Structures are given as C-alpha cells and as structure tokens.
Amino acid sequence: DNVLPVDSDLSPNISTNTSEPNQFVQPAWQIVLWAAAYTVIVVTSVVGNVVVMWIILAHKRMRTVTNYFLVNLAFAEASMAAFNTVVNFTYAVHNEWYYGLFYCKFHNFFPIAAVFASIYSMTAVAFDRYMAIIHPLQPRLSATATKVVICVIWVLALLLAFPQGYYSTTETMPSRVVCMIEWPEHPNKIYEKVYHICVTVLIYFLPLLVIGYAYTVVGITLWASEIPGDSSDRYHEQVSAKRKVVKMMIVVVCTFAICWLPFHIFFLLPYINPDLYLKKFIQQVYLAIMWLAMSSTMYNPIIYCCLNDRFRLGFKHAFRCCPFISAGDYEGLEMKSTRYLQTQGSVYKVSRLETTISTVVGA
C-alpha cells in the first residue's frame, strides 16, 4: 500500500516529494485548494496575532503575567503565519517539496517547535490560573520570572523539536508538503521508533494531562458560574473579573485540543501500524489533520475578542487611530485608571490600590 509516499507504487508513478509534483496522490485542484486555504490563513493569522501582540504591548494597562504568556502564544502563532505557512503555501502550489531535504528539515523543525511551545505554554497558563485562584497573595510572583518561564518553555520545546535535526527521525506528510516526524518507517539507523513514542507522550500527551489536571483543581475553586456584577457569588470585582479570564483560558485550551488532537492520534496510529491503512491510510487523512492544526493559529485572536471586553475595547482603541472608543468602553479597567493604551487613556503611573502598593504597579 505504501512507498516512501503514502500511495503505493504499483505503478512506477510514485516520485519523491523532493523531486516532483505528487499530482498522482491527489487531484491538482486539491493542491490549489490547500494552497488557497493557506493563503487566506496567512492573512488572518498574521493580522489577528499581530493585533494581540501589538495591543497588549501598546496598552500599558494590559500588563498581567497572563498577558505575558499570551504574547508568547501569539508569537508562536506569528511564526506559523510568517515562517511555516509561507513555505507550506509554496509547496502546495508547486505540488511538492521544491526546497528539498534540507528545507523539509527546516520546515518541520520550526513548525514542530511552534506546536510544542503552544501546548506547553497553555500548561503554564493553567498552573498560573491555579496559583491565582488558590493564593491571591500577589507577592509570590514576578514578571521577571514569567519571562524566564517563557524562555524555559522554548528551551523544552527545542528539546523535542531539535533532536530530529540531531540524528533522529525525519519526513514529509501525506500529500505532502508539510513536514513532520517520521511515523511511517522505522528507519533503523535513525532510531525512529523510540523517538516517536517519546515525543508524542512526553511533549503532547503529558502536558495535555497536566493542563487537564490543573483544570480539575480549578473546578473546586472559581468555576464557570460568574455573575456579571461583582455582587453575587463573587467576592470582589477583581474576583469576579478573574473568572472571565479563566473561562477564556479554558476555551483557548479546548480549541487547541480539538485542532491538534486528531493529528496526534493519527501520529500514533500509523506508528503502530505503518505500511497499512487506518480506517484508510491515505494522503487525505494525514493531510487534513495537519493542515487543520495550522488553523489553530487563527482561532485565538477571535476568542479574545469574543471572550473579553477588556481586550475588545482596548483593541478598538488601537484600531481607530484616535481614541474613538465608544461602545461603553471597558466599563471597568480599560486601564485601572481609566482608558488604557500606550497613551490616551493609560495614564502614566496608573493608580495604586491600598496604602501600600498592592499590585506591583505605579512603581
């Protein structure tokens, strides 16, 4: 059933993804279809993620530790839109890996790093949520640490992403020109088999479990129920506000799992039964999921807008060059003081709370 590519070479038709078009694998139009999907994605992913990164940096008020983690996520998405999607697009219209083996490596490595980093960052977010809920004590926490933490996630991400570059597994996806870890063969010199189990479980699965677990602990504490006003089942507006953040974080995770999980499952199943067909082992299946994972890059900016008024209002401030932020503003801390932005609403040295300075702000 299999050749180096997913299709059988009953005919001599099969040709290397590096050398020629893969038109035999799927209809040519399907190639343009995937190319089309990528092109549109590039626009959305770039604009949305840039907006997120831009807005939080631009608006002084949105400086939360969580915001730091989100920039990290946004950054990971940006790399996808700039780095990975572009190559994936070129290939698609070419119908194969014009770039050749070196590039397959470059292209797989960066995209792999992006996926690993995302799930790992989501875990940090989960843990931080747990910490915020149980121990509101603000001082046990530092912005500086967050940067350190973010860097750490990247380091671990490299731990999986980089070793394939080290003599380890390698390869292109079903129709593909997307490159990923070598699930198909057990290229012995390469020691593929070991790498495969290790990577999925350690990088994707374990972090998924932790996020799930941390999620459960949060269940006892702040839950979905949150009354819009501070009053009612909320003990302080800040407490009531936080519940909003947690819910978005939950949705962010959910969307993440839905997008990626199918790929990871297919990752493993072919590992167990390579050279065979799953329900059907084909170009189409592997392809659909990996490209689907790419869509994730776009979803987070949408969730933010829908999910939180603060970003929504603050973003709008950014969109219209001037303030022009009608629509009711944040009606809370657009900024703590009032409106928030680089300028405009976010007044220098935003106000402080408590005789002492409760939040590390107004420093």
Binding site: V3, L4, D9, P12, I14, T16, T18, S19, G100
Partner: peptide, 11 residues
C-alpha cells in the same frame, strides 16, 4: 521500488 538515479541527487 524507488528509482536509484535520484540517489545521487536526492534534492
């Protein structure tokens, strides 16, 4: 079976 000619120049 893959063609050996591309072996020299896989790229």
């Amino acid at each position: 079976r893959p063609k050996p000619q591309q072996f020299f120049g896989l790229m």
